[PDB]
Amino acid sequence: MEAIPVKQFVKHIGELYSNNQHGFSEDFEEVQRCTADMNITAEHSNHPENKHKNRYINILAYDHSRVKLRPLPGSKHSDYINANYVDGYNKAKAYIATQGPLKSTFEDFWRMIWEQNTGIIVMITNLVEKGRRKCDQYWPTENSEEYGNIIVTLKSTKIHACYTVRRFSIRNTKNERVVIQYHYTQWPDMGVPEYALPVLTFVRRSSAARMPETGPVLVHCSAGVGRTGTYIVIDSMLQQIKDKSTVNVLGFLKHIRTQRNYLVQTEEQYIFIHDALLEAILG
């Protein structure tokens, strides 16, 4: 609820960790339950003609907040993509949280990017992790690839230790637009990163790349809820800290849980959010 000053927040983290992290567990259970008295419809997600457009049968996109594609002539559900607008700090629809694109949704994905005037992609998964496919490669390995009316050209890549930055040019056939992809490459197969610092750097730089004024930042991992939620909360709280030197993780999280299911999927991620914010404050 109430935003608290950084100094108070910093001590509250220590509070949350104490007694075997009892506070962290209480908070997250509160998060888990915070929509129990809410019936939030996701009819489009669950429509049979949309089934193949969902990477997970049980990860849905709430109707009220879903990103709609302009309808295509010919069908009646060409409007659907498994993606939701999510608020950021003091800004509605700061993000589009979505699943890792499927081959079957590559065209929908880039069309969304074009239609929403998105200039930054944040990708927080490897395509394959421990042998399991997590995301399909929706971009060109080199030069150009065509997805529907959108042609995407890879212009440059910088490969850092923990993330990769790919600059693309995209254009609609009816090099018009620049799109920058920040692709984190070191998230562990299981659990959360052992050190927050690389993640903080990734978030700061990817967030700094957001140009005034453009469409929402697209954020995705595999399901578009866990790491994606974690990114959104960290970025937003860093924003709030920088702007007001207050923070409200629990309040903000319970709010965005209304906009896409399961954002910040585990207690461990919820804890990592704090570990990362503590280091940012101390740095």
mmCIF file with all atom_site columns, all heavy atoms in Angstrom, residues 1 11-13 46 99 106 135 151 155 183 220 241 258 264 274 279-280, unseen atoms left out:
data_model
loop_
_atom_site.group_PDB
_atom_site.id
_atom_site.type_symbol
_atom_site.label_atom_id
_atom_site.label_alt_id
_atom_site.label_comp_id
_atom_site.label_asym_id
_atom_site.label_entity_id
_atom_site.label_seq_id
_atom_site.pdbx_PDB_ins_code
_atom_site.Cartn_x
_atom_site.Cartn_y
_atom_site.Cartn_z
_atom_site.occupancy
_atom_site.B_iso_or_equiv
_atom_site.pdbx_formal_charge
_atom_site.auth_seq_id
_atom_site.auth_comp_id
_atom_site.auth_asym_id
_atom_site.auth_atom_id
_atom_site.pdbx_PDB_model_num
ATOM 1   N N   . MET A 1 1   ? 0.836   -1.233  0.000   1.00 0.00 ? 1   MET A N   1
ATOM 2   C CA  . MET A 1 1   ? 0.000   0.000   0.000   1.00 0.00 ? 1   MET A CA  1
ATOM 3   C C   . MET A 1 1   ? 0.857   1.266   0.000   1.00 0.00 ? 1   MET A C   1
ATOM 4   O O   . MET A 1 1   ? 1.159   1.820   -1.058  1.00 0.00 ? 1   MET A O   1
ATOM 5   C CB  . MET A 1 1   ? -0.929  -0.001  1.212   1.00 0.00 ? 1   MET A CB  1
ATOM 6   N N   . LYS A 1 11  ? 15.678  -1.405  5.659   1.00 0.00 ? 11  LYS A N   1
ATOM 7   C CA  . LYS A 1 11  ? 15.561  -2.138  6.915   1.00 0.00 ? 11  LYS A CA  1
ATOM 8   C C   . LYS A 1 11  ? 14.453  -3.181  6.843   1.00 0.00 ? 11  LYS A C   1
ATOM 9   O O   . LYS A 1 11  ? 14.544  -4.230  7.475   1.00 0.00 ? 11  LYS A O   1
ATOM 10  C CB  . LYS A 1 11  ? 15.284  -1.175  8.083   1.00 0.00 ? 11  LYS A CB  1
ATOM 11  C CG  . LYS A 1 11  ? 16.488  -0.315  8.468   1.00 0.00 ? 11  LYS A CG  1
ATOM 12  C CD  . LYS A 1 11  ? 16.261  0.446   9.769   1.00 0.00 ? 11  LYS A CD  1
ATOM 13  C CE  . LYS A 1 11  ? 15.581  1.783   9.524   1.00 0.00 ? 11  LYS A CE  1
ATOM 14  N NZ  . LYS A 1 11  ? 15.247  2.476   10.802  1.00 0.00 ? 11  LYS A NZ  1
ATOM 15  N N   . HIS A 1 12  ? 13.409  -2.882  6.073   1.00 0.00 ? 12  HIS A N   1
ATOM 16  C CA  . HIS A 1 12  ? 12.278  -3.792  5.907   1.00 0.00 ? 12  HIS A CA  1
ATOM 17  C C   . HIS A 1 12  ? 12.690  -5.063  5.173   1.00 0.00 ? 12  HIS A C   1
ATOM 18  O O   . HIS A 1 12  ? 12.156  -6.144  5.423   1.00 0.00 ? 12  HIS A O   1
ATOM 19  C CB  . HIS A 1 12  ? 11.160  -3.092  5.133   1.00 0.00 ? 12  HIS A CB  1
ATOM 20  C CG  . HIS A 1 12  ? 9.982   -3.969  4.844   1.00 0.00 ? 12  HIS A CG  1
ATOM 21  N ND1 . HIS A 1 12  ? 9.248   -4.582  5.836   1.00 0.00 ? 12  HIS A ND1 1
ATOM 22  C CD2 . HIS A 1 12  ? 9.388   -4.307  3.673   1.00 0.00 ? 12  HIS A CD2 1
ATOM 23  C CE1 . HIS A 1 12  ? 8.250   -5.256  5.291   1.00 0.00 ? 12  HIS A CE1 1
ATOM 24  N NE2 . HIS A 1 12  ? 8.314   -5.105  3.980   1.00 0.00 ? 12  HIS A NE2 1
ATOM 25  N N   . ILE A 1 13  ? 13.643  -4.935  4.261   1.00 0.00 ? 13  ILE A N   1
ATOM 26  C CA  . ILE A 1 13  ? 14.191  -6.107  3.596   1.00 0.00 ? 13  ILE A CA  1
ATOM 27  C C   . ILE A 1 13  ? 14.789  -7.043  4.637   1.00 0.00 ? 13  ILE A C   1
ATOM 28  O O   . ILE A 1 13  ? 14.520  -8.246  4.635   1.00 0.00 ? 13  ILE A O   1
ATOM 29  C CB  . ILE A 1 13  ? 15.280  -5.709  2.593   1.00 0.00 ? 13  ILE A CB  1
ATOM 30  C CG1 . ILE A 1 13  ? 14.651  -4.901  1.457   1.00 0.00 ? 13  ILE A CG1 1
ATOM 31  C CG2 . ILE A 1 13  ? 15.993  -6.949  2.079   1.00 0.00 ? 13  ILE A CG2 1
ATOM 32  C CD1 . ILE A 1 13  ? 15.637  -4.467  0.394   1.00 0.00 ? 13  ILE A CD1 1
ATOM 33  N N   . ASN A 1 46  ? -8.945  -18.394 -24.470 1.00 0.00 ? 46  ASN A N   1
ATOM 34  C CA  . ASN A 1 46  ? -9.484  -19.737 -24.314 1.00 0.00 ? 46  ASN A CA  1
ATOM 35  C C   . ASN A 1 46  ? -10.319 -20.174 -25.506 1.00 0.00 ? 46  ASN A C   1
ATOM 36  O O   . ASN A 1 46  ? -10.879 -21.263 -25.499 1.00 0.00 ? 46  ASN A O   1
ATOM 37  C CB  . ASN A 1 46  ? -10.347 -19.817 -23.052 1.00 0.00 ? 46  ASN A CB  1
ATOM 38  C CG  . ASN A 1 46  ? -9.525  -19.884 -21.784 1.00 0.00 ? 46  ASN A CG  1
ATOM 39  O OD1 . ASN A 1 46  ? -8.516  -20.592 -21.720 1.00 0.00 ? 46  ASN A OD1 1
ATOM 40  N ND2 . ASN A 1 46  ? -9.954  -19.150 -20.762 1.00 0.00 ? 46  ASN A ND2 1
ATOM 41  N N   . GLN A 1 99  ? 4.387   -13.746 -24.149 1.00 0.00 ? 99  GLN A N   1
ATOM 42  C CA  . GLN A 1 99  ? 5.089   -15.024 -24.160 1.00 0.00 ? 99  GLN A CA  1
ATOM 43  C C   . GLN A 1 99  ? 6.214   -14.990 -25.188 1.00 0.00 ? 99  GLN A C   1
ATOM 44  O O   . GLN A 1 99  ? 6.221   -14.142 -26.085 1.00 0.00 ? 99  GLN A O   1
ATOM 45  C CB  . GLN A 1 99  ? 4.112   -16.152 -24.515 1.00 0.00 ? 99  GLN A CB  1
ATOM 46  C CG  . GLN A 1 99  ? 3.463   -16.000 -25.898 1.00 0.00 ? 99  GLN A CG  1
ATOM 47  C CD  . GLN A 1 99  ? 2.417   -17.063 -26.179 1.00 0.00 ? 99  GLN A CD  1
ATOM 48  O OE1 . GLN A 1 99  ? 1.847   -17.652 -25.257 1.00 0.00 ? 99  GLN A OE1 1
ATOM 49  N NE2 . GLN A 1 99  ? 2.157   -17.314 -27.457 1.00 0.00 ? 99  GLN A NE2 1
ATOM 50  N N   . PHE A 1 106 ? 4.832   -15.747 -35.181 1.00 0.00 ? 106 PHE A N   1
ATOM 51  C CA  . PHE A 1 106 ? 5.865   -14.797 -35.579 1.00 0.00 ? 106 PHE A CA  1
ATOM 52  C C   . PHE A 1 106 ? 5.260   -13.558 -36.251 1.00 0.00 ? 106 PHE A C   1
ATOM 53  O O   . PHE A 1 106 ? 5.624   -12.429 -35.925 1.00 0.00 ? 106 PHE A O   1
ATOM 54  C CB  . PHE A 1 106 ? 6.868   -15.454 -36.540 1.00 0.00 ? 106 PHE A CB  1
ATOM 55  C CG  . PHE A 1 106 ? 7.899   -16.330 -35.862 1.00 0.00 ? 106 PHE A CG  1
ATOM 56  C CD1 . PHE A 1 106 ? 8.781   -17.087 -36.621 1.00 0.00 ? 106 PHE A CD1 1
ATOM 57  C CD2 . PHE A 1 106 ? 7.995   -16.385 -34.482 1.00 0.00 ? 106 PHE A CD2 1
ATOM 58  C CE1 . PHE A 1 106 ? 9.742   -17.883 -36.016 1.00 0.00 ? 106 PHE A CE1 1
ATOM 59  C CE2 . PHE A 1 106 ? 8.949   -17.177 -33.869 1.00 0.00 ? 106 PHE A CE2 1
ATOM 60  C CZ  . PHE A 1 106 ? 9.826   -17.929 -34.636 1.00 0.00 ? 106 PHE A CZ  1
ATOM 61  N N   . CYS A 1 135 ? 11.601  -20.740 -26.277 1.00 0.00 ? 135 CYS A N   1
ATOM 62  C CA  . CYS A 1 135 ? 11.184  -19.681 -27.186 1.00 0.00 ? 135 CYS A CA  1
ATOM 63  C C   . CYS A 1 135 ? 11.671  -20.045 -28.582 1.00 0.00 ? 135 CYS A C   1
ATOM 64  O O   . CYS A 1 135 ? 12.682  -20.725 -28.734 1.00 0.00 ? 135 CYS A O   1
ATOM 65  C CB  . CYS A 1 135 ? 11.797  -18.348 -26.758 1.00 0.00 ? 135 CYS A CB  1
ATOM 66  S SG  . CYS A 1 135 ? 11.273  -16.906 -27.729 1.00 0.00 ? 135 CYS A SG  1
ATOM 67  N N   . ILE A 1 151 ? 9.426   -6.732  -42.750 1.00 0.00 ? 151 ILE A N   1
ATOM 68  C CA  . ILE A 1 151 ? 10.742  -7.284  -42.999 1.00 0.00 ? 151 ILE A CA  1
ATOM 69  C C   . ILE A 1 151 ? 11.699  -6.797  -41.931 1.00 0.00 ? 151 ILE A C   1
ATOM 70  O O   . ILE A 1 151 ? 11.768  -5.608  -41.643 1.00 0.00 ? 151 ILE A O   1
ATOM 71  C CB  . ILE A 1 151 ? 11.260  -6.878  -44.390 1.00 0.00 ? 151 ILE A CB  1
ATOM 72  C CG1 . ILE A 1 151 ? 10.356  -7.491  -45.466 1.00 0.00 ? 151 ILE A CG1 1
ATOM 73  C CG2 . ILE A 1 151 ? 12.688  -7.354  -44.578 1.00 0.00 ? 151 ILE A CG2 1
ATOM 74  C CD1 . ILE A 1 151 ? 10.747  -7.122  -46.876 1.00 0.00 ? 151 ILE A CD1 1
ATOM 75  N N   . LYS A 1 155 ? 21.131  -5.494  -37.974 1.00 0.00 ? 155 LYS A N   1
ATOM 76  C CA  . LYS A 1 155 ? 22.133  -4.498  -38.346 1.00 0.00 ? 155 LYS A CA  1
ATOM 77  C C   . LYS A 1 155 ? 23.434  -4.675  -37.576 1.00 0.00 ? 155 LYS A C   1
ATOM 78  O O   . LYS A 1 155 ? 24.515  -4.619  -38.157 1.00 0.00 ? 155 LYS A O   1
ATOM 79  C CB  . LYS A 1 155 ? 21.587  -3.095  -38.101 1.00 0.00 ? 155 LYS A CB  1
ATOM 80  C CG  . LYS A 1 155 ? 20.199  -2.882  -38.666 1.00 0.00 ? 155 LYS A CG  1
ATOM 81  C CD  . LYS A 1 155 ? 20.158  -3.190  -40.147 1.00 0.00 ? 155 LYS A CD  1
ATOM 82  C CE  . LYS A 1 155 ? 20.683  -2.028  -40.968 1.00 0.00 ? 155 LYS A CE  1
ATOM 83  N NZ  . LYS A 1 155 ? 20.311  -2.193  -42.405 1.00 0.00 ? 155 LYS A NZ  1
ATOM 84  N N   . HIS A 1 183 ? 18.658  -8.886  -24.894 1.00 0.00 ? 183 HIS A N   1
ATOM 85  C CA  . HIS A 1 183 ? 18.457  -10.319 -24.722 1.00 0.00 ? 183 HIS A CA  1
ATOM 86  C C   . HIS A 1 183 ? 19.350  -10.817 -23.589 1.00 0.00 ? 183 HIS A C   1
ATOM 87  O O   . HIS A 1 183 ? 20.542  -11.001 -23.785 1.00 0.00 ? 183 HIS A O   1
ATOM 88  C CB  . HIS A 1 183 ? 18.823  -11.024 -26.033 1.00 0.00 ? 183 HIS A CB  1
ATOM 89  C CG  . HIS A 1 183 ? 18.715  -12.518 -25.990 1.00 0.00 ? 183 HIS A CG  1
ATOM 90  N ND1 . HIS A 1 183 ? 18.253  -13.208 -24.890 1.00 0.00 ? 183 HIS A ND1 1
ATOM 91  C CD2 . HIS A 1 183 ? 18.995  -13.453 -26.930 1.00 0.00 ? 183 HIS A CD2 1
ATOM 92  C CE1 . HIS A 1 183 ? 18.250  -14.503 -25.155 1.00 0.00 ? 183 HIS A CE1 1
ATOM 93  N NE2 . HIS A 1 183 ? 18.696  -14.679 -26.386 1.00 0.00 ? 183 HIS A NE2 1
ATOM 94  N N   . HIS A 1 220 ? 9.418   -10.116 -22.603 1.00 0.00 ? 220 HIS A N   1
ATOM 95  C CA  . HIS A 1 220 ? 9.016   -11.510 -22.704 1.00 0.00 ? 220 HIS A CA  1
ATOM 96  C C   . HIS A 1 220 ? 10.115  -12.435 -22.210 1.00 0.00 ? 220 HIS A C   1
ATOM 97  O O   . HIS A 1 220 ? 11.296  -12.110 -22.283 1.00 0.00 ? 220 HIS A O   1
ATOM 98  C CB  . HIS A 1 220 ? 8.635   -11.858 -24.157 1.00 0.00 ? 220 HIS A CB  1
ATOM 99  C CG  . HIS A 1 220 ? 9.803   -12.158 -25.049 1.00 0.00 ? 220 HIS A CG  1
ATOM 100 N ND1 . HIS A 1 220 ? 10.422  -13.390 -25.072 1.00 0.00 ? 220 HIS A ND1 1
ATOM 101 C CD2 . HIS A 1 220 ? 10.431  -11.404 -25.985 1.00 0.00 ? 220 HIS A CD2 1
ATOM 102 C CE1 . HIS A 1 220 ? 11.380  -13.382 -25.985 1.00 0.00 ? 220 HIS A CE1 1
ATOM 103 N NE2 . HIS A 1 220 ? 11.406  -12.191 -26.554 1.00 0.00 ? 220 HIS A NE2 1
ATOM 104 N N   . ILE A 1 241 ? 12.291  4.902   -7.098  1.00 0.00 ? 241 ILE A N   1
ATOM 105 C CA  . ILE A 1 241 ? 13.375  5.309   -6.222  1.00 0.00 ? 241 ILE A CA  1
ATOM 106 C C   . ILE A 1 241 ? 14.052  6.569   -6.749  1.00 0.00 ? 241 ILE A C   1
ATOM 107 O O   . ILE A 1 241 ? 14.244  7.539   -6.011  1.00 0.00 ? 241 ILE A O   1
ATOM 108 C CB  . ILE A 1 241 ? 14.411  4.176   -6.066  1.00 0.00 ? 241 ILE A CB  1
ATOM 109 C CG1 . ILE A 1 241 ? 13.859  3.111   -5.108  1.00 0.00 ? 241 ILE A CG1 1
ATOM 110 C CG2 . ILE A 1 241 ? 15.729  4.733   -5.553  1.00 0.00 ? 241 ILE A CG2 1
ATOM 111 C CD1 . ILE A 1 241 ? 14.719  1.873   -4.988  1.00 0.00 ? 241 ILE A CD1 1
ATOM 112 N N   . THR A 1 258 ? -3.375  -7.841  -11.657 1.00 0.00 ? 258 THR A N   1
ATOM 113 C CA  . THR A 1 258 ? -4.680  -7.718  -12.318 1.00 0.00 ? 258 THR A CA  1
ATOM 114 C C   . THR A 1 258 ? -4.557  -7.608  -13.845 1.00 0.00 ? 258 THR A C   1
ATOM 115 O O   . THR A 1 258 ? -5.544  -7.755  -14.560 1.00 0.00 ? 258 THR A O   1
ATOM 116 C CB  . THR A 1 258 ? -5.503  -6.489  -11.822 1.00 0.00 ? 258 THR A CB  1
ATOM 117 O OG1 . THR A 1 258 ? -4.844  -5.276  -12.206 1.00 0.00 ? 258 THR A OG1 1
ATOM 118 C CG2 . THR A 1 258 ? -5.670  -6.526  -10.299 1.00 0.00 ? 258 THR A CG2 1
ATOM 119 N N   . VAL A 1 264 ? 5.605   -12.213 -11.797 1.00 0.00 ? 264 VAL A N   1
ATOM 120 C CA  . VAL A 1 264 ? 6.470   -12.649 -10.702 1.00 0.00 ? 264 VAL A CA  1
ATOM 121 C C   . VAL A 1 264 ? 5.909   -13.938 -10.123 1.00 0.00 ? 264 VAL A C   1
ATOM 122 O O   . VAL A 1 264 ? 5.073   -13.927 -9.217  1.00 0.00 ? 264 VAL A O   1
ATOM 123 C CB  . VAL A 1 264 ? 6.566   -11.603 -9.577  1.00 0.00 ? 264 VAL A CB  1
ATOM 124 C CG1 . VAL A 1 264 ? 7.657   -12.018 -8.588  1.00 0.00 ? 264 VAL A CG1 1
ATOM 125 C CG2 . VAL A 1 264 ? 6.886   -10.239 -10.157 1.00 0.00 ? 264 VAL A CG2 1
ATOM 126 N N   . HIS A 1 274 ? 13.888  -7.920  -4.315  1.00 0.00 ? 274 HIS A N   1
ATOM 127 C CA  . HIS A 1 274 ? 14.407  -7.159  -3.189  1.00 0.00 ? 274 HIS A CA  1
ATOM 128 C C   . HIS A 1 274 ? 15.932  -7.192  -3.144  1.00 0.00 ? 274 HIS A C   1
ATOM 129 O O   . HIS A 1 274 ? 16.579  -6.171  -2.899  1.00 0.00 ? 274 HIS A O   1
ATOM 130 C CB  . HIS A 1 274 ? 13.824  -7.706  -1.880  1.00 0.00 ? 274 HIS A CB  1
ATOM 131 C CG  . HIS A 1 274 ? 12.360  -7.429  -1.708  1.00 0.00 ? 274 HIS A CG  1
ATOM 132 N ND1 . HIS A 1 274 ? 11.383  -8.149  -2.362  1.00 0.00 ? 274 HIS A ND1 1
ATOM 133 C CD2 . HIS A 1 274 ? 11.709  -6.517  -0.947  1.00 0.00 ? 274 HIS A CD2 1
ATOM 134 C CE1 . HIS A 1 274 ? 10.193  -7.693  -2.009  1.00 0.00 ? 274 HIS A CE1 1
ATOM 135 N NE2 . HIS A 1 274 ? 10.363  -6.702  -1.151  1.00 0.00 ? 274 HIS A NE2 1
ATOM 136 N N   . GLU A 1 279 ? 20.789  -3.909  -3.660  1.00 0.00 ? 279 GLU A N   1
ATOM 137 C CA  . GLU A 1 279 ? 22.096  -3.639  -4.240  1.00 0.00 ? 279 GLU A CA  1
ATOM 138 C C   . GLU A 1 279 ? 22.090  -2.334  -5.028  1.00 0.00 ? 279 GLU A C   1
ATOM 139 O O   . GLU A 1 279 ? 23.060  -1.578  -4.984  1.00 0.00 ? 279 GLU A O   1
ATOM 140 C CB  . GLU A 1 279 ? 22.527  -4.796  -5.145  1.00 0.00 ? 279 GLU A CB  1
ATOM 141 C CG  . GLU A 1 279 ? 22.668  -6.119  -4.414  1.00 0.00 ? 279 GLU A CG  1
ATOM 142 C CD  . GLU A 1 279 ? 23.828  -6.953  -4.928  1.00 0.00 ? 279 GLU A CD  1
ATOM 143 O OE1 . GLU A 1 279 ? 24.502  -6.507  -5.883  1.00 0.00 ? 279 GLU A OE1 1
ATOM 144 O OE2 . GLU A 1 279 ? 24.064  -8.054  -4.378  1.00 0.00 ? 279 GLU A OE2 1
ATOM 145 N N   . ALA A 1 280 ? 21.001  -2.054  -5.741  1.00 0.00 ? 280 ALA A N   1
ATOM 146 C CA  . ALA A 1 280 ? 20.925  -0.796  -6.475  1.00 0.00 ? 280 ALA A CA  1
ATOM 147 C C   . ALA A 1 280 ? 21.027  0.368   -5.488  1.00 0.00 ? 280 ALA A C   1
ATOM 148 O O   . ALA A 1 280 ? 21.780  1.309   -5.706  1.00 0.00 ? 280 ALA A O   1
ATOM 149 C CB  . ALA A 1 280 ? 19.612  -0.707  -7.268  1.00 0.00 ? 280 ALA A CB  1
#
